[model samples]
Target: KLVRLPGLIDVHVHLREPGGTHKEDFASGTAAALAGGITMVCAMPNTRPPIIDAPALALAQKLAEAGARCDFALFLGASSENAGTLGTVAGSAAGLKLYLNETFSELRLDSVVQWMEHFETWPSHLPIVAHAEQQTVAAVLMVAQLTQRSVHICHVARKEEILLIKAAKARGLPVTCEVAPHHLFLSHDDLERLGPGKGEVRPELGSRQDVEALWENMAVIDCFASDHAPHTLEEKCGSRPPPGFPGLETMLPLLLTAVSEGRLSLDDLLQRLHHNPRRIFHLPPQEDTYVEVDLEHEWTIPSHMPFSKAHWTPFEGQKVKGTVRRVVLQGEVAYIDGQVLVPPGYGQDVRKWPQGAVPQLP
Candidate 1:
């Protein structure tokens, strides 16, 4: 059997460009997206210089325009120095990303006042994406209610967090959240399987109970994002391994496997992976873009993926049921039968698409 899907959108990914290209760059990262049936990806901004200002945003945009093979958008990181001024570059960003707690990156916001500053100033059209966990999730909800601006929580990983979001939603707050495939599928008990250094990741993989809670409250999850943060095998295995996983290439198959097991339905899967991300991120539609998958095809995930610089995955050796057979982007065949067919410069930044412009398919 076959399934066709809109060119999927991943709102949370760390492409590691501008500063951390050794781990993953635009060319390699977007290639990974294509291999996994993701047509567009919103990249996080925690690079060496970070995308907190105009010049930084320009540098990252220039790289993606020249090198990305899949449609893409960039997030502007919010910091104490830039919070009061995000409006200056809001026109160019897919959204604003604020790290509310400690993570692999050093962009963590130190206080609630700093969070409030961003909520107060960031333009309402573009969302405020947050790497908030636990109490900070509550903090973001409180600020979102106070400011009446929408805030998106990135990688919600715990029982407490999702339930709070559930309660907030019940009250009709303009809050939305995403759950990473890793958190949905893997638990800390699998730590033994990944080895000590190899298992490191931000928000640390949760307990089986937490994973169950997320599944139980699946309706509350607005999006399914990869959080496709990548680090080289060397870095991940080093004494101080950075936290992240090479996810763009594996996200869809993992979820599709869950669907095969009846843990998720195809309709709900499409809602989270396609429709909701488009609406939440204000993403421009891609003309004539779609992905074809072989729903009954089954395969094992290889440790080394050719498209990404990270060169490894935590999902290595796992068996999955679905495989991407073809990907059409903007009327062009971009991937087919395990090969990427598009050139690096073929993708356009969706945020820069002309207002109300939907191009004709070739």
Candidate 2:
């Protein structure tokens, strides 16, 4: 039977435009999203120049409008250097992303305690997003408690991280968390096969215990995203591979396979795919977005594909049940039977988020 579902909304994706186009650009990346049945994606801000200030953000907005094939909400990076710009970005951004831990382009949360203490007093509606990994996960939860503000955590890979997010949600401290498709599907068991491509994600590959815990305590995860970072096959084959994967083309199919295997219910799949994301991020209703998935057709991922700058996927050679047949964005068929119908610039801006606009999680 033909299955109809709302086009998925991925809140965490690295399109790598403006500077990292060699890896993935707005055109190629969003095309990949369309091929995977995603109509919307929130582009991250950690590019080469970074989306820290208004000029940079404005350039990103212009670039996205000119190049993106699917709808996108680009975020602003938070740092002490850009404190003055947050107010403006907060008013229009999809949300503000604080890189609390992981890379050098992060804030490190040095005076983050002080910054948050002051944020408690300010009346705001924009959600503060964080990269919660290892020791940083608990600190992110506490910062949410400290500010009494809504915080969204990206890519929860560790068991401890999941429990912390679970407790924070229990206490009702305005916390929402996501798990990446890679974390859920591939794990330490696949490390030997996939190598650094599998083990080098931001939070790193989860231990067996962590991966097992994720599936066992799945209720705490509010949503799932592709986290579509990309690197050349040449780059990925090195001793120190870049920490990313070309996931936009594989995310939905993998999840569809999970559904076929009875690992996820249709209801839960819909929720994580678009419903929960639309609610939590306060994205505009997807009035004319949906994709047709062929549940009967089984396909195996290959190393060659047309819609991406990054030419390889870690999911190569894996067979998956269910495949996207068509993608409709804003009532237009962006992709159909392996062809892209619309060109870049068909996508509209998603930066104008209203204040106090959060939709309920449960």
Candidate 3:
């Protein structure tokens, strides 16, 4: 029997390169994405010099072409340093990435408007994917005022913020939001259970009420992404390390568990994890690509199975009720029965866009 769904698209991920290869590079990151049933990934641009300017963007493209194992695009950084260079890198990326709050020593909300207005008149439609939080709300509002282009809010972890997002959507605003696997599965209580190892990312996990709120507002969320932020166990346990829980390998299984428990329906899961991303990002459809999962299967969270150098995940040791049995990428079996079939460099770039009616803002 076969259960098929559209291939997954991860809009937010860090396939660190041009620096920070010791933590994760395109090869390892894409490998992990394929294992999680992701067919395409839009890599974040917060690497060592950062993918801020044209030179960095070209280098990132070269690195991805040379080593990526899955279809990929990039998120160009919008910062004070690169705000003036937006025109140079506008069309080269799937969208512009604005870090509203400070993370990894990069851009902030104050400079986001400058970057957004720079491309206000470009013929091509470019989406500005914002890493939303309280500090960045002002910046997001600013971008909304400047351009009619699409704007995506990444990783909606806070419950209160969802209300704001929903209000924006109701008002016919060009805004959409995403939720990560961690935010959906784990709560702040897990932070204590996993200790510092589990606590990572801004707008940290909220109370049980917050988690409940996320479930309540699920309909407002446009899509889901893993935000595959990988960090080594040693670095995670260190005194000065950033807090980020790994998710690439565990994304499917965790969501499957949610399905098994009746927390979410299969159709909704397929829409949020698979179809919605392609629609939101304007990715071309690959006719033969799909993913299959066994809803009855059970799996143990193994500590050493990470394709990423990051050895920790919030789901570690948690018994999951479902598993990804096979992943088909462009007519090839990329992963099967707990193994990766396609080797490095087997994945292709997804650039197909729909014709005719333009995508309506959600």
Candidate 4:
């Protein structure tokens, strides 16, 4: 018998659809999620057409329900173009996304306050999950005060930014911060080793001290997100491909290795990867979702098996200990022994956000 917990929920991921299939599509991305033992994922809205409005949101949900392999939910983009569409998308979305920095050219800080005010009056109460960085702290603070909506700060990449999130939380703001596995495992030194290939995202990989601070502050953080931004090896190694490394496959094993190495406790891992995301996203407790990992298993990451369109990962050459043996999603076995057991349509769209069971801003 395997030790089963609730399904894993990844609150941050970019499953490129409605365009950009050359990089990744919903099918390939969700397959990657299943292979990595993820049952539920909240996808980013930075798609080619961007899930910024009601029509786009509906289309994405429809596509996901029709074809996704694991349980999935949609998040609305908070860009200027989508500002007018908030009310239409807010009720059905997991949360409103604010790209604080220029990761995607969607929503910047200048328009976030306006968008937040619009959603504040709506009947549906949803959290605002922001792609936070240092440049947007003041703006985020202002929005937190104005809307008072629950805020989820994504990917704490810098030590100063982590402190800033802590300070914001200390003030009794409804704020939570998440750190990616890369930020916790790798340092700026890897940038030189990987060269331009590693320079794939914003709040670029930090120093050894930054990684150490992430580990030290793990208790204070709300959850761990993969930020599984994938790019083809050609794109990543190109002169100027986007700045992100494929993370979905490496997230759990890296954390498990840390557990084996005494860097993190299994209880903490459970809280950060499974329990906390559900709590933050207000997902209903389900009986049939958990990941079974063998702490003693050791294996090298294969270059092509379960290969995504994005052909590179930051942890490609690393020898990590521990392996995910199975993933159960919503009372069904979705993955087992490094292969996806679920069919193409096993995933479902989560439409319960409107039930009003989620907490609201006071």
Q: Pick the candidate with the highest TM-score.
A: 1
lDDT of 3: 0.75
- Which regions of candidate 3 are displaced past 4 Å? 106-124, 352-362
Say which prediction, candidate 2 or candidate 4, comes out ahead on lDDT. Answer: 2
In model 3, which range of ten residues has the least summed lDDT?
351-360
Better of 2 and 3 by TM-score: 2
lDDT of 4: 0.76
TM-score (all chains, Cα) for each model:
0.96, 0.93, 0.91, 0.91
Score each candidate by Cα lDDT. 0.87, 0.81, 0.75, 0.76
Per-residue lDDT of 197-275 in model 4, one digit per residue for the tens? 6565776888899888888877678899899887777887778778777777788888888988998788898898778
Reference-based TM-score, model 2: 0.93
Candidate 2, poorest ten consecutive residues by summed lDDT? 353-362
Query: Per-residue error at 35 for model 1, in Å?
Result: 0.5
Candidate 2 residue spans exceeding 4 A from truth: 106-111, 114-123, 352-362
Root-mean-square deviation of every model? 3.4, 3.0, 3.1, 2.5
Candidate whose lDDT is highest:
1
Q: lDDT per residue, candidate 2, 1-362, as tens digits? A: 78899878999999999899999889899999999899989999888788877888889999999999988888877766656446645656777777776665454446766457435532356666788687777876776766666778898888989988888778777888889888887778888988755457777777889988898888988899888888888888876778888798898889899899898788888899788998888888665888999988888889755677889887888899988999888888899989989898888676543432444343
Give the poorly placed runs of model 1, Cα more than 4 Å off: 103-106, 356-362
How high a TM-score does candidate 3 get? 0.91
